[PDB]
Amino acid sequence: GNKIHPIGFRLGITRDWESRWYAGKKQYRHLLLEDQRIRGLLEKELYSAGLARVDIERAADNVAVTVHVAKPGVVIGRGGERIRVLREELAKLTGKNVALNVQEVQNPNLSAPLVAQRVAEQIERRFAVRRAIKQAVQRVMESGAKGAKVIVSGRIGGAEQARTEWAAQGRVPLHTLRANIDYGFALARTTYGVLGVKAYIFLGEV
Amino acid sequence: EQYYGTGRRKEAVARVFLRPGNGKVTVNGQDFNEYFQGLVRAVAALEPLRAVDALGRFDAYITVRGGGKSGQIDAIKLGIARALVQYNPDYRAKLKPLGFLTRDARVVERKKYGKHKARRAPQYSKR
Amino acid sequence: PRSLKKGVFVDDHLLEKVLELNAKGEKRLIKTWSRRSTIVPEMVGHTIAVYNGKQHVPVYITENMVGHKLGEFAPTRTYR
Amino acid sequence: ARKALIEKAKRTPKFKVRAYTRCVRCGRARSVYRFFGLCRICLRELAHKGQLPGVRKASW
Amino acid sequence: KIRIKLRGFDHKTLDASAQKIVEAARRSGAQVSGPIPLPTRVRRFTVIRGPFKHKDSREHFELRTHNRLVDIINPNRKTIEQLMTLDLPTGVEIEIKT
Amino acid sequence: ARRRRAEVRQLQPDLVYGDVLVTAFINKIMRDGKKNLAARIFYDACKIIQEKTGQEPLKVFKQAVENVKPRMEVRSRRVGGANYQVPMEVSPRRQQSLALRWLVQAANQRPERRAAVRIAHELMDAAEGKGGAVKKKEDVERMAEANRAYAHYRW
Amino acid sequence: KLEGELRAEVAANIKRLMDIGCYRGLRHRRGLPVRGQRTRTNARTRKGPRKTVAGKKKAPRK
RNA sequence: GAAGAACCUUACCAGGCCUUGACAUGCUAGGGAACCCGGGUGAAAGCCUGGGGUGCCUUCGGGAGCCCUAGCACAGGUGCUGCAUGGCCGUCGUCAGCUCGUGCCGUGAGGUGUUGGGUUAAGUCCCGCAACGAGCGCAACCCCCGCCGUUAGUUGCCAGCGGUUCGGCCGGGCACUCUAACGGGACUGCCCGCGAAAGCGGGAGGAAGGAGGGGACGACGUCUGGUCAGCAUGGCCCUUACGGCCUGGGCGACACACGUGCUACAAUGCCCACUACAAAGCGAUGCCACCCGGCAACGGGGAGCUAAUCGCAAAAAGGUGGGCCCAGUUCGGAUUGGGGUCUGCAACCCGACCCCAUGAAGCCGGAAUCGCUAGUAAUCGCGGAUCAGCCAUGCCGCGGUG
RNA sequence: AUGUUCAAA
């Protein structure tokens, strides 16, 4: 049980925060619990949209929130009717009065969280783990990326003995503090139990 | 007219101002021998002077803040060493070989966790 | 070297229940879980039964033991 | 950390000394930091994600 | 004499921010005292790396807060015009006391 | 010290005799870095060597060190089973370290209630060739030269 | 109030909280610490010398 | 685990009490539905109950916020299984390693590469070689400490001038210290020596070096390692209870044994007085300036801070002077009697602090055993998290002397 | 000098 989170490790560089807003002492804890409330619903809802990140900027009673998706449609809605439901369901949580932008993911095949969830799902549907994994690494590796790697937890195939599956291609330097490796974790509830899924994608460097 | 040299040691800053004169020293107001009232080391600070037969030829006004009177004694010693160069830059040739123009980089060592004092590690018995 | 300050504390479960008995003289027993309370004169002569945390022990309150706190007369643990 | 034991939010301390922090995410009463409302664990989990604004990794 | 105090988490979201405030009002008031820095206050959170035991895991997290000042003496309407409603950064939050 | 040959820290001479050897001795007296009390004790002592002894303290001191430096010492060593104590010379460097250490040790082994005195009297005794300091020194040499049979394990 | 007359008082006190069912007094009789300290370890100043007994080995009492 | 056990926490025990049952989204039905103040009983919880007391919308049938009741979803379980698991963590081990691809060797397991010679902190690099390259790891990229400059000056100083209640207090001034942002700096780059090369030794300049000093960072895997009690989750079990509320007790008992620690054994010392140098932090019901009452804890009053501009704050060791005169002592503070402060509904069980009295063992530790390689050990004080208060002599961190 | 037996990954 070693190695740090590849993101948290690089936060100073090659990776910005998910919530970039000043605050302090009396507020910070309140102004943060909120962010979690926010993210809470978005992930509980926008699942089929393909969640990947939830930036949350601030300045004062005019929050940001910039959900990133693979299928920006599913988010918005018909003509923009859903972005009405949510955007409203939002203030029924934070009187704060906040926006709700939506950026599209340029190739969900380079989004560790996505590749992860991608695999997490297949596994839930009962696909061959090792296959799903190799495939995933291929997709990711086959559409850009200077390196990728996926890891599935254990009880592969519902086996009584928890195992751990691999798969990796090209440089994926977890040690190099400047790599720019996207990390993504996906759960996977199952008849037999939870099985975590980890996706690592390497892009450029400097 | 006047000469300057800072000087820092183990977390101490000393403003050293030399000025052609008698050879006295006003450290933070008090006399050199007044601020360092009874410290067998004090004599050190002015060593860079005797280095090139100064002292009884110069004079020094000195501001010192930070650390302890021992660290200050070394900051001041470096100050008097630097300033003594802006004056005549030719002093290096003899002032440096003594190492007076170096900034002792020895500082307190961070106190690491798991250990009592950065290194002093806790003890065990019938391990 | 004990100390409370200004306002000798006494739960009024037994207080206003002990002095009510002072009107008809005394009584025959009491029983409070308030071992937290200090003892005041009005308690003297009486017989309050304190709680071990398991039992209700009969404690005859005399003058010599006023300032104390009931519980100090109802042992908790069992040893030897 | 049983729903039942998260009566901490009940205010009603009857006396304000019965009040107690509790994790605002897992209920981890045991080592909850104030400045975050989070326990030593969650604080570490989130710091790794970047969801703790301007909370980088220390080192010196 | 309008004293502005800018605080932010990003040392750029301020140098950008507080710098706008300098170039702007530099055409409707005095000449600004330039954006003066001001010491940063760091918050350290030293946490044990994993759950259950391993007392010597750790890993440090700090939340450094930065400050800026500026100071515009000789307030002149247009100053409160070029500034009043023309900001941009989101990771910033001001406090002003003229 | 697996790599380098760890060079010796060079000490700043005495603030009175400008003698480095003195600083060294003063450092061996010091404890908890209270180097002032340490310097004092050695100087008070030097003035106790002036009174009770018409000689210059500095020379009494050096004389002492001299008689307390062991020239042969025994160093243990495993040689076929048993651990034979091999006798051998003592580096010039180690001689000092031991001499000074021994002085302070024996000095703090004396009775006189005053620290500064124990040092004063110990130094003198050492000069004359007597005292707990010189004991250890002569004990060491005795130890070697008494095991001078296993000296063919030269080391 | 000094000497004998004092020791008389103190002794007198203890005797009192000892006569009434008072606990603090029992701690005097039993000879154990009175000011609520731990009596599982460290009470030698009040107990006297350790009174070692036979015990249970293999059960890491370390 | 516990970065905060009096109730709470709390998972245990005793006794009282509740059952569709401190928190989540929701269903049908009757009913008063927001809410505010009391009483009876009680240890508290709870239970019973008196009761000021409703405005909202409507197709005028009735429907809402909120809430009680009866039945319901089914809830709820820190109840079992870490050998069913995720996650995270510890560990060998920051060790120099662990591998892959293709080629080549072998019937095969496998081997070669990764071995050999030189070198390195290093599978670091160099030369060699049926191997040629690559991935994880090393390094490096990131953080803190070592010098210089630019920008910025309510920090700073007569540096430099005038004034002074001569406090950098006043004007003034950014030079300096500093504050924080950026830029320069080290690379065996230059010189001599050996070497095939890597590099080793030496020297100059330089604040600094040969990776300059300390962090973050832990390879393929190992231990059926640790945690279902943080959370998540398969399976098993409980649903008048292995659930839930409450008061009280327990987690703090002792003839004893061990681990980790604190304080100490003493004159290189203890006490009183006077006097001097620090860093990093924290401050609104919060830090608490200053003034007053108290020997004091602390109480009353009250400024500023949302705090480089005020407060915590006194640094302690240290220097100077005096006292003590080697004694179980002006060592050592345990322990106990009394008085009292403070927080808190409440300090018996079971808080810290102050003042008087008391004033134990202990005179450097048997066998055995632990830490640390320089600003380190040793020693001295300062801050913080948790936090009402606090059992902190712990933990994380700071600088002083050295 | 001595420190039982047994499965799976």
GROMACS .gro file of C-alpha atoms in nm, chain B:
model
  127
  207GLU     CA    1   3.231   5.926   0.381
  208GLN     CA    2   3.067   5.594   0.472
  209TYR     CA    3   3.073   5.220   0.401
  210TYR     CA    4   2.825   4.934   0.413
  211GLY     CA    5   2.807   4.558   0.444
  212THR     CA    6   2.516   4.354   0.575
  213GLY     CA    7   2.602   4.016   0.721
  214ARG     CA    8   2.372   3.729   0.817
  215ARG     CA    9   2.433   3.426   1.039
  216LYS     CA   10   2.217   3.147   1.179
  217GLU     CA   11   1.921   3.383   1.134
  218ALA     CA   12   2.065   3.723   1.228
  219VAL     CA   13   2.101   4.044   1.028
  220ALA     CA   14   2.362   4.307   1.107
  221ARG     CA   15   2.380   4.647   0.938
  222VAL     CA   16   2.747   4.742   0.938
  223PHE     CA   17   2.845   5.104   0.875
  224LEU     CA   18   3.217   5.180   0.877
  225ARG     CA   19   3.332   5.543   0.887
  226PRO     CA   20   3.691   5.674   0.902
  227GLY     CA   21   3.741   5.773   1.265
  228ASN     CA   22   3.856   5.661   1.610
  229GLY     CA   23   3.764   5.293   1.617
  230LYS     CA   24   3.461   5.276   1.844
  231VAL     CA   25   3.143   5.079   1.780
  232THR     CA   26   2.781   5.160   1.856
  233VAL     CA   27   2.584   4.838   1.846
  234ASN     CA   28   2.214   4.928   1.858
  235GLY     CA   29   2.310   5.227   2.065
  236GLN     CA   30   2.502   5.064   2.349
  237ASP     CA   31   2.880   5.048   2.319
  238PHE     CA   32   3.026   4.738   2.152
  239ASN     CA   33   3.134   4.629   2.501
  240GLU     CA   34   2.795   4.733   2.637
  241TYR     CA   35   2.562   4.523   2.420
  242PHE     CA   36   2.794   4.221   2.451
  243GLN     CA   37   2.848   4.284   2.821
  244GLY     CA   38   3.045   3.975   2.921
  245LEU     CA   39   3.068   3.732   2.628
  246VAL     CA   40   3.411   3.577   2.576
  247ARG     CA   41   3.327   3.556   2.203
  248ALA     CA   42   3.240   3.920   2.123
  249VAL     CA   43   3.602   3.990   2.032
  250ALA     CA   44   3.532   3.785   1.719
  251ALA     CA   45   3.309   4.036   1.535
  252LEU     CA   46   3.597   4.284   1.490
  253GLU     CA   47   3.843   4.018   1.377
  254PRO     CA   48   3.793   4.119   1.012
  255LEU     CA   49   3.931   4.461   1.109
  256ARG     CA   50   4.252   4.346   1.279
  257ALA     CA   51   4.266   4.142   0.961
  258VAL     CA   52   4.389   4.446   0.768
  259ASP     CA   53   4.503   4.670   1.055
  260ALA     CA   54   4.179   4.866   1.078
  261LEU     CA   55   3.979   4.936   1.395
  262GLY     CA   56   4.208   5.215   1.513
  263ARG     CA   57   4.148   5.380   1.178
  264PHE     CA   58   3.776   5.324   1.123
  265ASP     CA   59   3.461   5.340   1.331
  266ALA     CA   60   3.135   5.146   1.318
  267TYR     CA   61   2.766   5.210   1.367
  268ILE     CA   62   2.577   4.882   1.375
  269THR     CA   63   2.212   4.779   1.377
  270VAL     CA   64   2.151   4.421   1.482
  271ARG     CA   65   1.818   4.239   1.501
  272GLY     CA   66   1.742   3.867   1.492
  273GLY     CA   67   1.854   3.549   1.663
  274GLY     CA   68   2.087   3.560   1.961
  275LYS     CA   69   2.384   3.769   2.068
  276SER     CA   70   2.603   3.486   1.943
  277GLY     CA   71   2.456   3.476   1.595
  278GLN     CA   72   2.464   3.852   1.589
  279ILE     CA   73   2.834   3.839   1.676
  280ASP     CA   74   2.887   3.644   1.354
  281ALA     CA   75   2.653   3.852   1.138
  282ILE     CA   76   2.832   4.164   1.258
  283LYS     CA   77   3.164   3.992   1.193
  284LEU     CA   78   3.050   3.933   0.833
  285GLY     CA   79   2.914   4.285   0.805
  286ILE     CA   80   3.243   4.443   0.910
  287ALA     CA   81   3.399   4.203   0.660
  288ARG     CA   82   3.180   4.306   0.365
  289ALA     CA   83   3.175   4.678   0.431
  290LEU     CA   84   3.552   4.662   0.468
  291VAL     CA   85   3.550   4.566   0.098
  292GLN     CA   86   3.326   4.835  -0.054
  293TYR     CA   87   3.588   5.063   0.098
  294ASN     CA   88   3.901   4.902  -0.042
  295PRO     CA   89   3.804   4.612  -0.274
  296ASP     CA   90   4.167   4.502  -0.250
  297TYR     CA   91   4.111   4.362   0.100
  298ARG     CA   92   3.961   4.041  -0.041
  299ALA     CA   93   4.308   3.904  -0.113
  300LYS     CA   94   4.369   3.873   0.263
  301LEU     CA   95   4.020   3.900   0.408
  302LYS     CA   96   3.884   3.600   0.214
  303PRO     CA   97   4.154   3.338   0.279
  304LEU     CA   98   4.038   3.364   0.641
  305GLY     CA   99   3.685   3.293   0.522
  306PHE     CA  100   3.534   3.607   0.671
  307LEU     CA  101   3.351   3.669   0.343
  308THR     CA  102   3.151   3.348   0.371
  309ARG     CA  103   2.797   3.320   0.505
  310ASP     CA  104   2.792   3.026   0.746
  311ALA     CA  105   2.482   2.845   0.615
  312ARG     CA  106   2.443   2.627   0.926
  313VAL     CA  107   2.081   2.668   1.041
  314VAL     CA  108   1.853   2.480   1.281
  315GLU     CA  109   1.734   2.149   1.138
  316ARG     CA  110   1.361   2.097   1.093
  317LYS     CA  111   1.195   1.882   1.360
  318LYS     CA  112   1.077   1.571   1.173
  319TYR     CA  113   0.779   1.372   1.295
  320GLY     CA  114   0.819   1.031   1.451
  321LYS     CA  115   1.137   1.161   1.610
  322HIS     CA  116   1.191   1.372   1.921
  323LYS     CA  117   1.417   1.634   1.773
  324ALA     CA  118   1.483   1.601   1.399
  325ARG     CA  119   1.713   1.311   1.472
  326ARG     CA  120   1.697   1.215   1.838
  327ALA     CA  121   1.488   0.903   1.784
  328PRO     CA  122   1.266   0.761   2.062
  329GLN     CA  123   1.407   0.458   2.248
  330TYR     CA  124   1.280   0.102   2.283
  331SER     CA  125   1.325  -0.178   2.535
  332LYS     CA  126   1.309  -0.552   2.476
  333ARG     CA  127   1.274  -0.496   2.102
   0.00000   0.00000   0.00000
